């Protein structure tokens, strides 16, 4: 998953 990736996970909070 994408949100297990930081750059990604900061990128997208309502995501992740």
């Not at 990736?5 to 309502?14: F, G």
Request: net charge negative; proline share 19%; hydrophobic share 20%.
């Amino acid at each position: 998953g994408c949100c297990s990736l930081p750059p990604c996970a900061a990128n997208n909070p309502d995501y992740c």
